[PDB]
Amino acid sequence: ADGRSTRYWNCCKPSCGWAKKAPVNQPVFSCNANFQRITDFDAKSGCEPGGVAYSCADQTPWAVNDDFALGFAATSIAGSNEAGWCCACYELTFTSGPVAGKKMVVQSTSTGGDLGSNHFDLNIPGGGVGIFDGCTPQFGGLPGQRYGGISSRNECDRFPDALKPGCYWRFDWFKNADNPSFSFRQVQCPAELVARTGCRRNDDGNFPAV
């Protein structure tokens, strides 16, 4: 199918981080304010007052080679819902921008009220907090515009160390692509992605392996 992308990092607990969202073995892991994995899936999101659960820093993209990367995204898929997309993995083939022709496999770990139809909001530290700002409470805040985040690669140099790799990826593998278009199909989640979130759908084994 065809989709549109944006970029984000708001530090909030991901929506597929709650139990009862989808038919999975366990929800996506959340972390404490110091980027360390916690196991209380009922823990209050850090984007809410008195919350303690934030997005883990390892739920960020990385390059496997110059034409292939792995990562995560907040999704809104037409005709579906959180029960259908939480923890599902999708292979995106970019169709526009400087990354046209490259592919990336992402695991869907959340969604947003502002997402349109077939809209993938890629997890990218420095890509913009958007509606909620959980990074201020978590560690003091991230630089950049509310929507769109930072604009230069050297601005990644002052990020908390755990968020640096994801920040640099944006300018390195991704070439600072500005909301590139893509084609997508559902795939079985690579073991590398489930190792970071802990979350695998019961129906994962029905889709093609990458």
Ligand X SMILES: OC[C@H]1O[C@@H](O[C@H]2[C@H](O)[C@@H](O)[C@H](O[C@H]3[C@H](O)[C@@H](O)[C@H](O)O[C@@H]3CO)O[C@@H]2CO)[C@H](O)[C@@H](O)[C@@H]1O
Rounded to an integer, what distance in angstroms lies between the CA atom of residue 126 and that of residue 104? Answer: 19
User: Please, which residue, 48 or 172, has the CB nearer to ligand X?
Assistant: 48
Residues 28-87, interacting with ligand X (CB under 6 A):
45, 47-48
User: With respect to ligand X, which residue has the nearer C-beta, 105 or 142?
Assistant: 142
Among 2, 67, 157, 178, binds ligand X (CB under 6 A): 178
What single-letter amino acid sits at 188?
Answer: Q
Contact residue for ligand X among 147, 155, 162, 164 (CB under 6 A) = 147
Using CB under 6 A, which of 130, 165, 166, 180 touches ligand X?
130
Neighbours of 34 (CB within 10 A): 11
Strand partners, 71: 106
Is residue 30 a contact partner of residue 55, using CB atoms and an 8 Å limit? Answer: yes
Q: Which residue has the tokens 């349109």?
A: 116
The rounded distance, in Å, linking the Cα atoms of 38 and 182 is 34
Token pair listed for 39: 């196991």
Q: Which is nearer to ligand X, 13 or 188 (CB)?
A: 13
Q: Which residues contact 48 (CB under 8 A, 6 or more apart)?
A: none
Alpha helices in 123-178, H assignment, sequence order: 135-139, 164-171
* Shortest CB 110 distance to ligand X, Å: 5
Nearest distance from residue 83's CB to ligand X, in Å? 12
200 touches ligand X by CB under 6 A: no
- Using CB under 6 A, which of 50, 101, 113, 140 touches ligand X? 113
**Shortest-Cβ-distance residue relative to ligand X:** 128
Where on the chain is the footprint of ligand X (CB under 6 A)?
Answer: 6-8, 10, 12-13, 15, 18, 45, 47-48, 110, 112-114, 121, 127-132, 147-149, 178-179
